[PDB]
Amino acid sequence: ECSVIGYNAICINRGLHQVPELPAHVNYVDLSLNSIAELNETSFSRLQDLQFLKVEQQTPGLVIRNNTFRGLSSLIILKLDYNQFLQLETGAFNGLANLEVLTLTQCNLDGAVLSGNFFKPLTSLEMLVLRDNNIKKIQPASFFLNMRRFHVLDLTFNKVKSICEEDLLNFQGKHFTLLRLSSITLQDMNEYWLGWEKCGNPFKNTSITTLDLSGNGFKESMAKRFFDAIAGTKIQSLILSNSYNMGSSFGHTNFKDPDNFTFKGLEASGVKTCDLSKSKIFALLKSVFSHFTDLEQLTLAQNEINKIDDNAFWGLTHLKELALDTNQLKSVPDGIFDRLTSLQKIWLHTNPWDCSCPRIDYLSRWLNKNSQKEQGSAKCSGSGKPVRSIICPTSASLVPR
């Protein structure tokens, strides 16, 4: 009951229990949402030309036998997502020497998938998506040393209590363009952990373009330790959004805003963009950012910021883009932006600005001189006029009668 148009065969949701007879010339086959219970060598022995195979969400318990993919040397993308309780025989992916993307989201997989030989045949793999599985420890087997182009790994929504040097030993040498460690908790990596000395540097001799550690809490004391531990790792862009424990509270005394020591390990990482948006930061302290010496973009949007110290931004001479919107700022100190000499864009909107004079004098004049840089429009609380338009009267002694 498939729809075969040209090189494409769409067999989505047709109540199939086996791979159906398709024409031998097809290169794109989608068999998602069916009742196929097992895939073996005879499953694709007539579809030898496939480039894109998709077999998502079968009825639960799909088994993939040894040599199912023998001689699909043309297959580049294989998607096996949402297959509850997936069973892989350990030579399941034999033959796939040219495969570049494998996605296995939500298949109840655990660490064995990365530590056994399941992925050994995949010498060309660039992109491995393993979201929302049950991986507790990221422990890649030794063949990963030889996957020259493995560069994208997404582990979002696994619960991984820690990441350590000896865990990631076979990722040493890699350059990851996207190492996505989002929403994995890193529960054990905190103030109270005795395992820090032994953990070392999970990223020893590894480089990263985008390191996504969002949604993992990152209380100030955890960030410090974590970035000391990975001190010196080349990272181009650092995502720490939804660091739900970052910032201070009158409620729990322990908790503090990040300081000039917090991000010191990132000193020589060459970070170009840093996202700390959507967190709980209440104050920007002296020199908190003074270690990102190559920083070009910084977002602190949607925190709870209501205090910016003199020198919050010391050492950000290369910064092009700064976002401070949607906080609780009534004011900023005089001259706070003066040494941001590469500033191209700034966001200051959705803050309750107090436009009393002479408090608002510096920000108003600045926002006017730099109106081409302001994205959106910071407004005065109460009146709702733009802060750009406020001309403060001058103090009487400066213009004597």
> Which residues contact ligand NAG (rule: CB under 6 A)?
18, 38, 40-42, 66, 89-91, 173, 175, 205-207
Tokens 């004049």, residue? 365
The answer to whether the bond into 358 is cis (omega within 30° of 0) is yes
Name the residue nearer to ligand NAG (CB basis): 158 or 206: 206
CA 227, CA 376: separation in Å to the nearest integer? 34
Q: State the minimum distance, in angstroms, from the CB of residue 342 to ligand NAG.
A: 28
Phi (first) and psi of residue 42, to 5 degrees: -85, -10
Name the residue nearer to ligand NAG (CB basis): 93 or 362: 93
CA 329, CA 307: separation in Å to the nearest integer? 7
Single-letter amino acid code for the residue at 384: G
Name the residue nearer to ligand NAG (CB basis): 183 or 206: 206
In this structure, the strands spanning 235-239 and 345-347 are unpaired
Q: State the minimum distance, in angstroms, from the CB of residue 92 to ligand NAG.
A: 8
Name the residue nearer to ligand NAG (CB basis): 234 or 339: 234
Q: State the minimum distance, in angstroms, from the CB of residue 96 to ligand NAG.
A: 14
CA 337, CA 355: separation in Å to the nearest integer? 18
CA 208 to chain centre: 11
Q: State the minimum distance, in angstroms, from the CB of residue 246 to ligand NAG.
A: 28
- Comparing every residue's Cβ against ligand NAG, the nearest one is 91
Q: State the minimum distance, in angstroms, from the CB of residue 120 to ligand NAG.
A: 9
Q: State the minimum distance, in angstroms, from the CB of residue 89 to ligand NAG.
A: 5
Name the residue nearer to ligand NAG (CB basis): 35 or 42: 42
Name the residue nearer to ligand NAG (CB basis): 4 or 16: 16
The three-point CA angle 213-215-216 to 5° equals 70
CA 198, CA 103: separation in Å to the nearest integer? 32
